[PDB]
Amino acid sequence: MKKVALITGITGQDGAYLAELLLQKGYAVHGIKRRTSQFNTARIDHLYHDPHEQGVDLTLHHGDLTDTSSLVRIMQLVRPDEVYNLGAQSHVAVSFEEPEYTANSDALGALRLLEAIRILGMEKQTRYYQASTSELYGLVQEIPQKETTPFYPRSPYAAAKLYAYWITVNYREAYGIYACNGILFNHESPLRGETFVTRKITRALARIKIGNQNRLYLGNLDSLRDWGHARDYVEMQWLMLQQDQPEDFVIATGKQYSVREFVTLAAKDIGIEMRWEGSGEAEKGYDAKTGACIVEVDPRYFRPAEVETLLGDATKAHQKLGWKPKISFETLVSEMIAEDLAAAARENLLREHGHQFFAPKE
Amino acid sequence: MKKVALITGITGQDGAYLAELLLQKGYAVHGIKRRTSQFNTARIDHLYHDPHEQGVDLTLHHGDLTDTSSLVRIMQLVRPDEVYNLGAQSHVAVSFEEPEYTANSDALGALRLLEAIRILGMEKQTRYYQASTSELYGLVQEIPQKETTPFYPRSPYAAAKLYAYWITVNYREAYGIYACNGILFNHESPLRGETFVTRKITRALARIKIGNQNRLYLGNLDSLRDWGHARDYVEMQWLMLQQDQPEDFVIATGKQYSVREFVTLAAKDIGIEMRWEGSGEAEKGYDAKTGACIVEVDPRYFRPAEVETLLGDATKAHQKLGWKPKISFETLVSEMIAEDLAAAARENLLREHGHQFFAPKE
Amino acid sequence: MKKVALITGITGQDGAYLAELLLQKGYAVHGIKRRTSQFNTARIDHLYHDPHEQGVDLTLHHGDLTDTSSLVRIMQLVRPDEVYNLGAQSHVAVSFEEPEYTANSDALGALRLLEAIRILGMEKQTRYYQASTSELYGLVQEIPQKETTPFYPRSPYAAAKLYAYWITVNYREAYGIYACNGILFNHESPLRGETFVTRKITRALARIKIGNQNRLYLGNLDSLRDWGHARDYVEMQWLMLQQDQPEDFVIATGKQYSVREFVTLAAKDIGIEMRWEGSGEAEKGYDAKTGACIVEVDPRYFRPAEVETLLGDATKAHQKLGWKPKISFETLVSEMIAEDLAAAARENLLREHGHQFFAPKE
Amino acid sequence: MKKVALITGITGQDGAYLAELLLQKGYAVHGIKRRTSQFNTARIDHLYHDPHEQGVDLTLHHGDLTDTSSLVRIMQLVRPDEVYNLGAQSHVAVSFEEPEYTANSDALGALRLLEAIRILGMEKQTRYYQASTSELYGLVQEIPQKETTPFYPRSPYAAAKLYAYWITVNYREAYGIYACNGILFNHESPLRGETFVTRKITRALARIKIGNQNRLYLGNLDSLRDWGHARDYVEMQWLMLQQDQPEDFVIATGKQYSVREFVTLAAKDIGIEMRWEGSGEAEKGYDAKTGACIVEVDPRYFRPAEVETLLGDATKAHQKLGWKPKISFETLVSEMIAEDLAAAARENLLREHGHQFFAPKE
Ligand SMILES: NC(=O)c1ccc[n+]([C@@H]2O[C@H](COP(=O)([O-])OP(=O)(O)OC[C@H]3O[C@@H](n4cnc5c(N)ncnc54)[C@H](OP(=O)(O)O)[C@@H]3O)[C@@H](O)[C@H]2O)c1
Ligand SMILES: NC(=O)c1ccc[n+]([C@@H]2O[C@H](COP(=O)([O-])OP(=O)(O)OC[C@H]3O[C@@H](n4cnc5c(N)ncnc54)[C@H](OP(=O)(O)O)[C@@H]3O)[C@@H](O)[C@H]2O)c1
Ligand SMILES: NC(=O)c1ccc[n+]([C@@H]2O[C@H](COP(=O)([O-])OP(=O)(O)OC[C@H]3O[C@@H](n4cnc5c(N)ncnc54)[C@H](OP(=O)(O)O)[C@@H]3O)[C@@H](O)[C@H]2O)c1
Ligand SMILES: NC(=O)c1ccc[n+]([C@@H]2O[C@H](COP(=O)([O-])OP(=O)(O)OC[C@H]3O[C@@H](n4cnc5c(N)ncnc54)[C@H](OP(=O)(O)O)[C@@H]3O)[C@@H](O)[C@H]2O)c1
Ligand SMILES: C[C@H]1O[C@H](OP(=O)(O)OP(=O)(O)OC[C@H]2O[C@@H](n3cnc4c(=O)[nH]c(N)nc43)[C@H](O)[C@@H]2O)[C@@H](O)[C@@H](O)[C@@H]1O
Ligand SMILES: C[C@H]1O[C@H](OP(=O)(O)OP(=O)(O)OC[C@H]2O[C@@H](n3cnc4c(=O)[nH]c(N)nc43)[C@H](O)[C@@H]2O)[C@@H](O)[C@@H](O)[C@@H]1O
Ligand SMILES: C[C@H]1O[C@H](OP(=O)(O)OP(=O)(O)OC[C@H]2O[C@@H](n3cnc4c(=O)[nH]c(N)nc43)[C@H](O)[C@@H]2O)[C@@H](O)[C@@H](O)[C@@H]1O
Ligand SMILES: C[C@H]1O[C@H](OP(=O)(O)OP(=O)(O)OC[C@H]2O[C@@H](n3cnc4c(=O)[nH]c(N)nc43)[C@H](O)[C@@H]2O)[C@@H](O)[C@@H](O)[C@@H]1O
16 A cells, blocks of 8 residues: 655655655655744645645654653554654754754654664554664774774764664664664755755855845865765665664765865856965965955854764675765756756845845854 | 944844844844754745845854853853843744753753853853843733732743743842843744744744645634744844843733634735634634635644743833834734635645655654 | 562662562562662561561562663563652752753652563553652642642752653553543651651651750741552552553542641650740740740741642542541651650660661751 | 763663772762652662762652753753663563664763753763674674674664664764773673573572472573673773773683573573573573472563573773673672572561562563
8 A cells, every 4th residue: 555654854855855755656645743833844845746636645643752742642643654753953053052962863763763663563454664874883893894993973963863863773773673874875856954064155146246245254274074875875764664674774876075176166167267275274265367255264163073084885785775975066066056046036136126135144 | 343243043033033123234143053953944944135235244153052062162262241141942842742841941041141241250241131031921910911920920931931030130230240141022924933923923824825725723812922022022132232221121012813813814815814612622724715624633743731921011122122013913823824825835846856855744 | 470570769768668669569679779778678577587488479670760771671671560760869859950850860760660661562451650749739729639720840859740640641641541640739758768757757756865966957937748668558559550440530538737737746656745936037945844945946847849738639539449547647646756766776776785876868 | 080970771780880989989979860659779779879978979869861951951951971771671582672762861861861962061071882793793793792892673662772872872972982892791780670581580489499480481591601700891891091092902711601500500500400402492591309390481471582602802902901801601600599489588588587478570
């Protein structure tokens, strides 16, 4: 019959792309949405577009990863075949300011879902995906990082995810629940949250190009990341729940780029050749042709403990799942720059027609 | 020197209006904001508009009412003279779906702030305002309701707020902390959350008038509420912290209107004379001139236990504070209808210029 | 067939007496016990005494009122016909030191149990008793206090209990769950915790008479309490769950005595005629015959906000349940004094035979 | 000038031994004690014995590891130079029944203490010890296990401890707080909780020898453990806080014994030579001389996921700290058997003199 999926974090980047994929595969899709003082469904509102009157099997439920009652209620109501725990306080910098809330959401949240499956007698009915992460590798102990690279978390977010990784393994080993860990490396999109580095860059460059913004302030320009596109990555989240046995998989492109390179690439798409002068906190990025200063370093964006370099070896995912990234880095950055230009243009169009719009800033 | 205020719930309706008021009074204003996967500051983004380059003393901090560590950290960092606990899971209908999260945020959240003042030795420095509510009267034991009317909660939200009312009273009596309860009756605005009844109505009527929406579905049409404007009410929140002694005050207009009356008034503002035909769940609201069906009843919007009527006697606030509502009900409904028309018009302008916009729905 | 009862707080005073009563009535009795680093079942160990080899249907489960998963797991496993929420951080003085933990256990704990009944679909099978309390009346608004006397909490314990009272009322009214509030006034026994005032007195007097202790230090000697015996009161807890409709009942003796009177009565049973000289913090109690100082006042035992007098009108319980206290105040105090002498004697017997025993102190 | 120590879990085995050690070293010792419905200080009551009237600088505070407010209050009140986080839901089997409570106590509890040190500005005043454990190695990846052996948790307790290990490392690296992890292997004593395997065996064998108990029921007899004496290990907890730099250390004897061996050794001390007949769940242990059945296997004591073998390489602690176990395995087992015999004799003495005592059982 119709497959039922329950997605926590459905309003986030991955949840949006995953809901779309599962709707297109014919699922009855349910999402756990936080109560919010305003609409917070901007990433998925388009999924309710139904011109043919065919019907959209998308259902949103109020709950919170800190609230076991709400999670057990929704699990009981929905009775899903597949649970995707994508919900999280997902920002590493913020986890230094809210470590307890982050642990409660990201570590105990997974336990609550797994314990709900056990309490409700769903061990043979429900498959469970945990949104694990390359942040587990932190101060990397091998280069590249694979499934067997020992973990070394460097933030309260990664410590919390490490718990969720191991509580997922424990429920698989102790109880036989189909529970697995997607160890996904950084993946971005035009739906990426605005204060993560890639979206912050493409958003600042777009508004600098239009003229609504003056400067882009960044932190560690030397930080190296394996960056993919979220549309490719959520497909591996679905596929990992379709296998005969539950297993953990690294998902990654196998190439890493620095924050400096990301700025330089993204600046090209808006017609700026970046020139870098200076070292450390003094380093600055300039438009080569005009001489204008585009990028400066603000140490307020350094993290208390940095993860300097991530690079994933997804050999096993390639062999067992056929993992191959379809969207390339350069394609990713162009889509993000184009989408952010359009957003800045939509804000100019409003102000051109006498409607006020005041932009948000971090 | 400069007065320091800390506002929880600063991204909400009251928090936005209170931040504006306190900025204009010269405060250094600090808000506690939840981590969110998107920008969620649309109610206060305009407050950073600074054409004269004078500077805006508005600071946002990441924290959560369920996280004691984050609240003590911010309280310790900010050291405010005035704390306004406006943050809450504030929707009564949702509190039946997330009673535990609601209790954790709305009841224990207030304790965490008060206990932080005590632990940090701030009893003689910090005055505390608790966002109490007319929901405490629930199944009303007197009509009208005043400060001495016994409480009777009817939802997990009001049960939680009742705790926060008394823990605030207790810390005032046990420890001598300046802690008081604004017992505020329903107050609305163009910043009201879209799923509360008044904003749901004005938003639905605006989009029906434009033609973007077909029908408005409501629950209990007979529910009676004392409705004021949030801009008037937040002024009394500030004033209650300026007194010689801490005291609890009912704030209310003294007149109540039904949900049916609200639809009728708001439809009148868009040129529709409502005609009501039918009883109970079969009751429907029609355009008298065109005959078109505008409003129907869906039992899905009933609450498990209803609060049927609220009406506040704010005599004591009038005598001691000079409380007198400046904005009238009819003005409030007009301002809300105009703003929702403008918002729907901004979305048509986007689609008229080839930009896609998909609207959210509850 | 066999009735199933679930008792939180089974290791406490009421839980021990209630477990015994329900075992004698033929129940399958289940208790939620906290994990403890030592055996903590001394109040109920005797219930496992089975010389006739009949069998004792007493089962203990690990859980905690702060842990929703543990409560739902146990509720799912046991599927009880009757739930008695006796578990609590029950000490008023401690609630000023641990207000948050007290709220989480005493307020949210009851919600977790009620929400488990609803989530598990047990609304038509399970009846729920909430251990409400005369502490709700706090700064008493009527003398005597009855079901309709408005509440006035005076500690973080009473605030937390007030929430649990109203969430019990709300689940009854909103969902039709058989849930009621026993508004029980103070009840004591030889199993009373050692730092509550009556047991502190009888324990100190027994050890003073034997010679193991020198002086009894107390706080507010003028505090007035309606004191009954827990063995009578747990019978009304059981009976309230046997009625046709769920209802809240005050249970009380209808007479109150002061702390000073309790000392004087309890001292009389060990052969000491108390004579009181002095006022306030200087007041002291002496043995009339020997002149020795037995009682002094230590302000360290005052509460930040005191409840000065409690006196219950249990007319409705008398009329509707046949509530009549069988054990009198004087019988209660004699039984408490006898048990504390016996305990002090069992400790002297150990040391006389070369076994060391070191007694605990507050 | 007097050194101040704060010990969570002071009523537990290690806390009792650590309190004694620090009192002898001249500390002002503070413990966090849970509110309990009875006295729960039996492990430390003897520490208040003061024959010379010199004074005992031991202070107990009410708090809970699940309650951030109570922890910050105590940290603020006590302002210790050394914090020892020994408090925990420490039983591995129970953690499968209360995984969430265990996570809240054992994982987030450590964070709450570390975050309190940071919020209160104590980073340069306070050293922090985390009670990490050989359970982190779980499904051991190296034999023997050293500081660099990768972790592999096998229970919700170890998953929770793994979080607390890494949040301790993270606060050391991100903030420079003197915070270290004692990775202690199993250590026992006569104060060991009665349901851990070693104390369950010695307690059951003593009562079997006296004749008060018939049979000892155990689970996995093949489990291998590196067993030391808690009195030796708490000395290393103190010493790890006296070094120049914070560092993590394995503490272990370097020899492992099986559960079967422990029974056999302990039975010898009560004059029973164990003979084992059978395999697996049919395996039974008999008195070789009398033929009586002493030990049987009950699968109810199996854990859902077992830790089969632990063996510690404490080379680094030996080289840097001078670690050498002073008390041997045989000495530990003899001491535990003697105390359990003495305890069982005290219970007969009570019943021999006409006093009732009903013993507890797991
Ligand atoms: N992006 C990457 O490169 C990457 C890599 C590896 C792993 N991951 C993990 O994969 C998941 C998806 O990432 P993402 O990029 O989609 O993150 P995201 O954009 O920040 O989405 C987070 C989602 O979780 C929700 N959420 C947060 N706290 C919650 C709570 N207490 N209860 C319920 N829902 C809560 C958010 O709701 P709101 O919309 O209300 O805030 C949002 O829907 C996360 O767990 C993330 O940590 C991400
Ligand atoms: N409006 C009325 O008529 C009325 C009447 C009486 C009393 N009150 C009370 O007065 C307060 C203000 O009302 P309002 O209309 O401004 O409500 P609102 O629009 O719903 O604002 C609630 C605010 O609290 C924040 N919040 C929610 N849960 C939180 C959590 N766990 N941690 C931290 N912040 C959290 C929300 O953040 P997000 O934006 O991220 O969701 C938002 O900023 C509320 O406490 C409400 O219950 C309101
Ligand atoms: N006694 C009275 O006169 C009186 C009057 C009115 C109402 N009440 C209420 O009636 C109930 C019974 O009173 P009582 O005298 O029996 O109290 P008690 O002797 O202090 O018993 C409290 C029980 O609750 C357990 N408990 C505490 N915290 C818990 C938690 N977080 N999770 C699970 N269990 C927990 C305790 O376990 P431990 O043994 O491990 O501590 C104990 O079994 C309480 O709710 C009390 O407030 C009492
Ligand atoms: N024993 C070993 O071989 C071993 C080896 C490695 C690591 N460890 C760890 O080292 C520590 C000490 O072990 P142990 O044998 O002394 O354990 P234990 O006998 O079980 O002591 C645990 C202590 O923590 C307290 N506690 C439990 N939950 C608490 C909470 N929520 N809030 C506050 N206090 C709480 C307990 O109080 P009550 O008395 O009220 O229950 C008790 O004082 C534990 O963290 C343990 O897991 C032990
Ligand atoms: C893999 C990991 O990716 C994301 O985790 P992060 O929060 O680490 O990713 P982000 O893209 O924000 O940062 C990556 C690297 O960029 C550096 N950086 C430099 N300047 C800036 C700046 O101004 N802002 C931000 N946000 N980062 C900056 C950072 O120091 C860092 O090294 C989340 O999606 C997690 O949920 C996920 O687990
Ligand atoms: C006073 C109280 O006001 C608000 O509390 P409420 O949640 O009760 O206000 P709301 O405006 O949502 O409802 C008032 C009355 O309208 C009836 N109603 C009828 N049809 C609908 C419908 O479709 N949607 C909603 N939301 N309500 C409907 C409800 O039954 C109710 O009786 C919040 O701001 C609280 O935080 C605050 O404490
Ligand atoms: C009704 C209420 O009774 C109990 O609540 P309490 O905590 O109020 O009862 P307790 O017996 O401790 O105190 C009653 C009155 O005695 C006064 N008092 C004087 N000297 C002392 C002293 O040394 N110790 C204590 N504990 N109290 C002292 C107190 O100030 C107070 O006025 C618990 O069972 C609750 O759970 C229950 O809800
Ligand atoms: C190291 C670790 O030691 C302790 O952790 P554990 O809970 O694993 O120690 P325990 O002594 O309970 O068990 C050790 C081994 O004995 C086996 N076993 C066999 N039969 C029984 C039985 O009847 N009861 C118990 N309790 N265990 C039994 C178990 O399967 C296990 O393999 C705690 O102190 C932790 O906090 C600490 O971190």
